[PDB]
Amino acid sequence: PSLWKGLVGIGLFALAHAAFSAAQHRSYMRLTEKEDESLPIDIVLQTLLAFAVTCYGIVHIAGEFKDMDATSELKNKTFDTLRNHPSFYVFNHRGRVLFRP
Amino acid sequence: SLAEVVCLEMVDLPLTDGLLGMFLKRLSSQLILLQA
């Protein structure tokens, strides 16, 4: 469904928020200068979840696969269509006379 | 008096368990920064 598309947006949005958090946490270090060198578990969990869901949405978004056998789409092609030859059309048929000229 | 200085130093200026709580405070900080 189309809702899949909407999902991927929010995933990025989620990721975007994570970025902000990370930046802030980096500022934290850049204002704490302690031997932490570790991101908060909440923010990393949020980032991982955003990655997972966004990838999952993408999986739907990629589309649908197509079968390799060339005789797939031609099965329903009746002979009444392939014979038309649009370039070689002729207008000397009963359609013009029968219908309004 | 500052003609004869003995020692000087440079001092830096002054600065200008559950995941649900962490998210709550983080989102609160986000709203605070947005308001600022």
How far apart CA A11 and CA A52 sit, in angstroms, is 9
How far apart CA A83 and CA B35 sit, in angstroms, is 69
Q: In the PDB record, what is the listed experimental method?
A: cryo-EM
How far apart CA B28 and CA A42 sit, in angstroms, is 14
Provide the shortest C-alpha distance from residue A17 to chain B (in Å): 9
CB atoms closer than 10 angstroms to residue A34: 8
CB B31 within 8 A of CB A47: no
Those residues whose C-beta lies under 8 Å from the C-beta of residue A49, and which sit 6 or more positions away, are A14
CB atoms closer than 10 angstroms to residue A45: 15
Q: Could you tell me if A45 lies within 8 Å of chain B, comparing CB atoms?
A: yes
Burial of A57 (0-12, 13-18, 19+ CB in 10 A): buried
How far apart CA B25 and CA B31 sit, in angstroms, is 10
- Give the residues after which the backbone of chain B is interrupted, taking a C-to-next-N distance over 2.5 angstroms as a break: 16
Of all residues in chain B, the one with the smallest CA distance to A20 is: B30
Q: Could you tell me if A24 lies within 8 Å of chain B, comparing CB atoms?
A: yes
Q: What is the CA radius of gyration of chain B?
A: 22
Q: Across the interface, do A46 and B29 touch by the CB < 8 Å criterion?
A: no
Q: Could you tell me if B16 lies within 8 Å of chain A, comparing CB atoms?
A: no
**Got the DSSP string for B8-33?**
----PPPP---HHHHHHHHHHHHHHH
